[PDB]
Amino acid sequence: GTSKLKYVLQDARFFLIKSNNHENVSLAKAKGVWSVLPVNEKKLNLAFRSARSVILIFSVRESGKFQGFARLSSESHHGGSPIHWVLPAGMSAKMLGGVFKIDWICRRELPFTKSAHLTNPWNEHKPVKIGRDGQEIELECGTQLCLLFPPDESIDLYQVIHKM
Numbered sequence: 001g002t003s004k005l006k007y008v009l010q011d012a013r014f015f016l017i018k019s020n021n022h023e024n025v026s027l028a029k030a031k032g033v034w035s036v037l038p039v040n041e042k043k044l045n046l047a048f049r050s051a052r053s054v055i056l057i058f059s060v061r062e063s064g065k066f067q068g069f070a071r072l073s074s075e076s077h078h079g080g081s082p083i084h085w086v087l088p089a090g091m092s093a094k095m096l097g098g099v100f101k102i103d104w105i106c107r108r109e110l111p112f113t114k115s116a117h118l119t120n121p122w123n124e125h126k127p128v129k130i131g132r133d134g135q136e137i138e139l140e141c142g143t144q145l146c147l148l149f150p151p152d153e154s155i156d157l158y159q160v161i162h163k164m
């Protein structure tokens with residue numbers, strides 16, 4: 001059912017995350033970590049204190065799809081073992097050195113075709129698939145977008161529910 005997911009998403013903030021490459025999303029899905037640029041890292045740490053849950057919704061550039069969504073379980077961390085990210089054009093192993101711990105809620109894909117009815121009021125009521133990396137998605141739009149994803153049998157929400 002959706003009671004568990006709705007509980008997780010009650011009073012959540014939502015952010016569109018754009019990856020240039022599939023490799024880092026595969027790494028992140030397995031390991032439960034993500035890193036962003038400094039501009040977005042500040043917003044995510046502010047949000048992590050502001051919010052009961054902070055949800056990252058992933059889309060690989062040019063894929064036409066979202067690849068899943070995850071909940072921050074930590075503020076950005078520096079100083080851990082390096083994550084061997086596939087670094088894009090001219091980015092440093094310290095340009096995204098801040099590491100967020102994340103718990104995946106859904107690792108299954110959602111094609112942009114299934115979310116075409118949803119617009120983000122905080123991006124001029126454009127369809128939610130449209131957005132800059134780190135674009136914040138308004139509460140109800142983000143909630144409905146997350147509810148569109150198919151159930152993921154690899155995920156157990158018990159840990160997340162306990163972390164809250």
Ligand SMILES: CNc1ncnc2c1ncn2[C@@H]1O[C@H](CO)[C@@H](O)[C@H]1O
Binds near residue numbers: 020036133
């Ligand atoms: C793990 N962290 C990341 N992995 C892959 N692409 C990223 C990324 N963080 C930011 N990007 C993207 O790479 C570009 C930064 O130069 C932007 O277009 C972002 O959308």
